[PDB]
Amino acid sequence: DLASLAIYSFWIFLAGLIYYLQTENMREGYPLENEDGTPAANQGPFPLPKPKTFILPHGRGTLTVPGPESEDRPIALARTAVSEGFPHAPTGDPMKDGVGPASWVARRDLPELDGHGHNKIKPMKAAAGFHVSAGKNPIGLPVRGCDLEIAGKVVDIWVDIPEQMARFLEVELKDGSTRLLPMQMVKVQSNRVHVNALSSDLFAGIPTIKSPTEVTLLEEDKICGYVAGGLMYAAPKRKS
Amino acid sequence: ALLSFERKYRVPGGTLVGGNLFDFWVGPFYVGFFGVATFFFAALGIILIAWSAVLQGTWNPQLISVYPPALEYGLGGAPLAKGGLWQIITICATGAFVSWALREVEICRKLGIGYHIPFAFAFAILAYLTLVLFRPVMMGAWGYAFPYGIWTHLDWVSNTGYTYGNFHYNPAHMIAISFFFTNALALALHGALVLSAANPEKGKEMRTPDHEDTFFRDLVGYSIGTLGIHRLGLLLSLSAVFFSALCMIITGTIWFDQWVDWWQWWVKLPWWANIPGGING
Amino acid sequence: AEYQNIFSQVQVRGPADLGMTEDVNLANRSGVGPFSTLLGWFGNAQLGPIYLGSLGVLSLFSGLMWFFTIGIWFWYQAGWNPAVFLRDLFFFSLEPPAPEYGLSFAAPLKEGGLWLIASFFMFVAVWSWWGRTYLRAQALGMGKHTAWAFLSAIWLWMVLGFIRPILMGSWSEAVPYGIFSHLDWTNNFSLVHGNLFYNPFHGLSIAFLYGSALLFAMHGATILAVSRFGGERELEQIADRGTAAERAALFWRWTMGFNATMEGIHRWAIWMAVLVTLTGGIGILLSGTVVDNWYVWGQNHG
Ligand code: BCL
Ligand code: BCL
Ligand code: BCL
Ligand SMILES: CC[C@H]1c2cc3[nH]c4c(c3C)C(=O)[C@H](C(=O)OC)c4c3nc(cc4[nH]c(cc(n2)[C@@H]1C)c(C(C)=O)c4C)[C@@H](C)[C@@H]3CCC(=O)OC/C=C(\C)CCC[C@H](C)CCC[C@H](C)CCCC(C)C
C-alpha cells in the first residue's frame, strides 16, 4: 500500500541523504594520510565530492574545496614507536614550536573583516565609542598566572565591532611590551585577572602581533593555541 | 588513517589514569584507559544480551528483550533468566557510558579544549539513570525500570504514561517538551542561517556574521548572536533533558495519581472556585 | 574553577548597529529598540531594528486577529467574567465544526464558524510570514535555507489543520484552539489510530527530535569548547579553517571515528531538524486517509 511505499521510499532517500552529508563533510582534511604525510591506502567507502567555490568578500579571493591539503608550516614532532597509532613527541619546546594543544593553523596573515570591510577586531581605545557596559571593567587590573605571580596589567580590551563583544585582553608586561590574552581564558575578579593556563614566566613567550592596532587570523591562532597549550605544558608550574 | 591536519595534535599526555600505558589510537579512535574500560563494559553487556536472547529463544533484533526483575523481587538480586541479566547489563551500560564520558575528558585534555561535551553528555547519562536506577530505587523495585528491547521499551513508555492518565498533564513534562520543540526550532534556524550566509545567491560573495545579525533583526527584531546561539542550543537541549529526568523522578514518588487532577489546585483557589459560568462552574 | 563561557564576564557596547544594507529598503526598518544588559549576559544586548514592510503588517495584523478571535471566544465561554477567564484559561477551547457540516463554511458562528475565521487568519499570518523569511534573505543576497527549513514546519501544520481535514472530508478532523484541548486532541488522535508508536513515521519523527537535541548539545558544546580559539566565528572558519575547526573535528574523530567540517555540521543540523516535521507530517497525513490503525498496518507490515 501507499504507506509501505512511503516508508520504503523514505529509507532510500535517507541513505542518499547520509551519503550526501558525509561527503559534504569531507571537503576538508581528506585525502587521509599516513603519519609521514603520504596518502593512506585506505580512504574508506565515501569518495570526495566535486569541488565547490566560496567567493570571499573584499578582494580576498576564493576557496575551493576539496583541494590540495598542506600544513604550510614545519611540525616539530617525531615518532615514538615503530608502528602507526602512537603519540608523536615534541622535538623541542612544544609551546614555542606550536604543536600538541599549543597548535596553530597557517591561517591567512590578514585580519578578519566585517561586512563593511573594516577590521572586525580592534583595541577598544581605537573603537569609537565602544565602552564597557556591564560587569567588572578589567582595564587596570594586575594579571596573575597559575604560579600565583603577577605577570602584567590589563591596558585594554580588544573588541569585536560588528558583534559588540570582548575578544581579548591586552596585557602589558614588565618590559613595557604587550600581549593579547583570549577573553575565554581569563577570569576577571574584583582585584585581579587570573590566568590558569599560563604561569607568569610564560607570558613573554605569547606570540606577538606585528601591528599594535590590529590582529591577523594567523596571529590569533598562534596566540590562542599558545595560551591553551599552557594547560598541559605549564602543569608543572601549577599549583593548587 | 590521519586527517591531513591531524598529526600535530597527536602528542602524548592528557590521560587521567595509566600515564602512557594506553595513550594511543586504533585507526581514528583514541583509546586511553577509559577506551579499554568502555570496550570491556560494552563487550560484557553485549555478550550478556546475546545470552539473554538464547534464554528468551530468539535472535530477532525486533524481538530480543531483556526485562528487569518482576516487582516481587523489590530491590534484591534476581535469577539471571528472571531479571539478573538485566541487572548486570545495566551495570555494564552505566560503566560503558561513564567510561565514554571520561574518555571524552582525556581527549579534551590532549586537545586543549573545554570540557563542555562530556559535561553535556552527563545529562543524557543522568536521564538514563533516572529511569533505570534513581526512580526504581525511590519506588522500591527494579521492575519499574524499562526493559531493553526495541518494541518492549515502547510498551513500557505507553504503560507507564497511561498509569497516570494522559501524561501530557505532567507539568514538568510540558516544560521538557517545550524545550525539545524549541531546541529543534533553534537547530533548524542555526543550520539555515549559517548555510544561507556561506552559500549566498549565485555569484555573490559569502555573507558575514553582520548579515546573519541583520537577517534576524530584520525578521523578528532580535539576534542572539553567534556566541549566543551555541550557548542557546546547548541550554535548550540540556534543559529539555533536565526537565525530562525531573518529570519522571517525581512520577510514582511525590505524585502518583492522575496528572490531569494536579491542575485542580488552580481552579479550586478560594477567590474564584465558586463563581458560576466558564468550564468549571 | 575555570571560566566556561556560558555567561559573559564583561559586556561592551558601541553605537547601535543598524545592520547591513545590501538591497534592503531602509525606509521599512524601525529605529533601534532598547539595550538589555540582562540579555547581554547570554547573547546580544541590542534590540531592533526590525523590518516592517507591507507583508509584515499583513502577517502581524492577521496573526493578532487569529489570537483575538480565540480570545474573544474564550471571554464568551467565561461569561465575560475576568475571574472565570483566568480560572478556566487553559480549559477554554475554540472547536472546529461538527462532522455533519463536512467541509462547508455553513456552520453557525458559535458552532464552528468562528473556528474557520480564526483558522483563515492563521493561514494568512503563517504564509505571509513564510514570504517574509524568503524576502528578507533575498534582500540581503543570502541563500533561502531559512524559508526552506520553515516550510518543513509549515508542512506538519498544514497537514494537521488543512490538508488532512480536506482529505478526510470534514473540518471536524482539525485541531481545536485551546491549551488543554489540543493535548486531548493529540492523545485521542493516537488512540483512535491504533497507537502512533506503531506508525514508522512517528518513530522516525521521534528519532529526529531526540537526534536534534543530541546534535545541538554536541554542536553547542563543541563550539563553546573551542571558543577559546574563536570557534563561534564559523563563517570565517569555513573560509579559512583554524585550529578551532581542527580541534573540534578531531575531538569527534577520536571519539567516534568520524567528524564534520565547520560548514558541513550546519548541514547535519538543518536536516536533523527539518526531518522532524517532514516525517511527522507524512505520518499524520497517512493516518485515517490510507491507514486507519497503525497496529493493524504493522501486523501486515503493509
Ligand atoms: C502514551 C505515552 C505518553 C508519554 C509518557 C512518557 C514517559 C513514560 C516518558 C516520557 C518521556 C518523554 N516524553 Mg512523553 N508521553 C507522551 C507524549 C509525548 C509527546 C507528544 C508530542 O505527545 C512528546 C513530545 C513527549 C516527549 C517527552 C520527552 C520530554 C521525554 C523523552 C526524552 C528523554 O527523556 O530523553 C532523555 C534521554 C535518554 C534517556 C537517552 C539516554 C541515552 C544515553 C545515556 C546512552 C545510550 C547510547 C547507547 C545505547 C549507544 C548505542 C551504541 C551505538 C554505537 C549508537 N511525550 C504520551 C502522553 N513520556 C520520558 C522521560 O522523561 O524520561 C526521563 C519518559 O520516561
Ligand atoms: C527517551 C525516553 C524513553 C524512550 C522513548 C522512545 C520512544 C517513544 C521512541 C524511542 C525510539 C528509539 N529509542 Mg528509546 N526511549 C528510552 C531510552 C532509550 C535508550 C537508552 C536510555 O539507553 C536507547 C538506546 C534508546 C534507543 C531507541 C532507538 C531504538 C529508537 C531511536 C532513538 C533515537 O534515534 O534517538 C536519537 C539518537 C540518535 C539519532 C543517535 C543514534 C542512536 C540509536 C540509533 C542507537 C540504537 C541503540 C539500540 C539499537 C540499542 C542497541 C545497543 C547495542 C546492544 C550496543 N531509547 C526511554 C525509555 N524511544 C523510537 C523508536 O522508533 O523505537 C522503536 C521511538 O518512537
Ligand atoms: C498520547 C499521545 C501520543 C502521541 C501522538 C502525537 C500526535 C497526534 C502527533 C505527534 C507528533 C509528534 N510526537 Mg507523538 N505521541 C505520543 C508519544 C510521543 C513521545 C514519547 C512517548 O516519548 C514522543 C517523544 C513524541 C514525539 C513526537 C514528535 C517527534 C512529533 C511532533 C514534532 C513537532 O516538532 O511538532 C511540533 C511542531 C509543529 C506542530 C509545527 C508548528 C508549525 C508552525 C507553522 C507554528 C505556527 C505557530 C504560530 C502561528 C503561533 C505563534 C505564537 C508565537 C508566540 C509567535 N510523541 C503518544 C503515542 N504525536 C506529531 C507528529 O508529527 O506525529 C507523527 C503529531 O501530529
Ligand atoms: C543531553 C542532550 C541529548 C544528548 C547529548 C549527548 N549524547 C551524547 C553526547 C552528548 C553531548 C556525546 O558526547 C555522546 C556521543 O559520542 O555522541 C556521538 C552521546 C551519545 N549519545 C548516544 C545515544 C543517545 N543519546 C540520546 C539522547 C541525548 N543525548 C539527549 C537528548 C538518545 C535518545 C534520545 O534515546 C540516544 C539513543 C550515543 C550515540 C553516544 C554515546 C555512545 C556511548 O556511550 O558509547 C559507549 C557504549 C556503547 C558503545 C554500547 C553500550 C552497550 C551496553 C553495555 C548494552 C546496551 C544496553 C542498553 C541500555 C540497551 C538499550 C536498548 C534500547 C532498545 C532501549
Ligand SMILES: CC[C@H]1c2cc3[nH]c4c(c3C)C(=O)[C@H](C(=O)OC)c4c3nc(cc4[nH]c(cc(n2)[C@@H]1C)c(C(C)=O)c4C)[C@@H](C)[C@@H]3CCC(=O)OC/C=C(\C)CCC[C@H](C)CCC[C@H](C)CCCC(C)C
Ligand atoms: C522544522 C521543525 C521546527 C520548526 C522550524 C521553524 N519554525 C519557524 C521557522 C523554522 C525554520 C522560521 O523561519 C520561523 C521563524 O520566523 O522563526 C523565528 C518559524 C516560526 N515558528 C514559530 C512557532 C512554532 N514553531 C514550532 C516548532 C518548529 N518549528 C519545529 C520543532 C512550534 C511548536 C513546536 O508547536 C511553534 C509554536 C514562530 C515563532 C515562527 C513563525 C511565526 C509566524 O508564522 O507568525 C505568524 C503570526 C504573527 C505574525 C504574530 C501572531 C501574534 C501572536 C499570536 C501573539 C502576539 C505577539 C506579537 C508578535 C506582538 C506584537 C505586538 C505589536 C502591536 C507591538
Ligand SMILES: COC(C)(C)C/C=C/C(C)=C/C=C/C(C)=C/C=C/C(C)=C/C=C\C=C(C)\C=C\C=C(/C)CC/C=C(\C)CCC=C(C)C
Ligand atoms: C486578555 O484577553 C486578550 C484581549 C489579551 C485576548 C486573549 C487571547 C487568548 C487567551 C487566546 C488564546 C489562544 C490559544 C490558547 C491558542 C492555542 C492554539 C493552539 C494550541 C493551536 C494548535 C494547533 C493548531 C493547528 C494545527 C492549526 C492549523 C490551522 C491551519 C493549517 C489553517 C487552515 C485554514 C482553514 C481551515 C481556513 C480555510 C480558509 C481557506 C479557504 C484558505
Ligand SMILES: COC1=C(OC)C(=O)C(C/C=C(/C)CCC=C(C)C)=C(C)C1=O
Ligand atoms: C549564526 O548565529 C545565529 C545567531 O546569531 C547571528 C542568531 O541570532 C540566531 C537567531 C536567534 C534566535 C532568536 C533563535 C530563534 C529561536 C526561538 C526561541 C524563537 C541564529 C539562529 C543563529 O544561527
Ligand SMILES: CCCCCCCCCCCC[N+](C)(C)[O-]
Ligand atoms: C547518523 C547517521 C550515521 C552516521 C555514521 C556514518 C558516517 C561515518 C562515515 C565516515 C567514515 C570516516 N571516513 C572513513 C570517511 O574517514
Ligand SMILES: CCCCCCCCCCCC[N+](C)(C)[O-]
Ligand atoms: C536489545 C536490543 C537488541 C539489539 C539488536 C541490534 C540492533 C539492530 C537494529 C534493528 C535492525 C532492524 N532490521 C534492519 C533488521 O530490520
Ligand SMILES: CCCCCCCCCCCC[N+](C)(C)[O-]
Ligand atoms: C522573538 C523575539 C522577539 C523580539 C522582540 C521585538 C523587539 C523589536 C523592538 C524594535 C522596536 C523599537 N521601537 C520601539 C523604537 O520601535
Ligand SMILES: CCCCCCCCCCCC[N+](C)(C)[O-]
Ligand atoms: C547508526 C550507528 C552506526 C554505527 C557506525 C558509526 C559510524 C562510524 C564510522 C567510522 C568508522 C571508523 N573506521 C575508519 C574504522 O572505519
Ligand SMILES: CCCCCCCCCCCC[N+](C)(C)[O-]
Ligand atoms: C540528518 C540525518 C541524521 C541521520 C540520523 C539517522 C537516525 C535514524 C534513526 C534510526 C532508527 C529508526 N527508527 C527506529 C527510529 O525507526
Ligand SMILES: [Fe+3]
Ligand atoms: Fe554553529
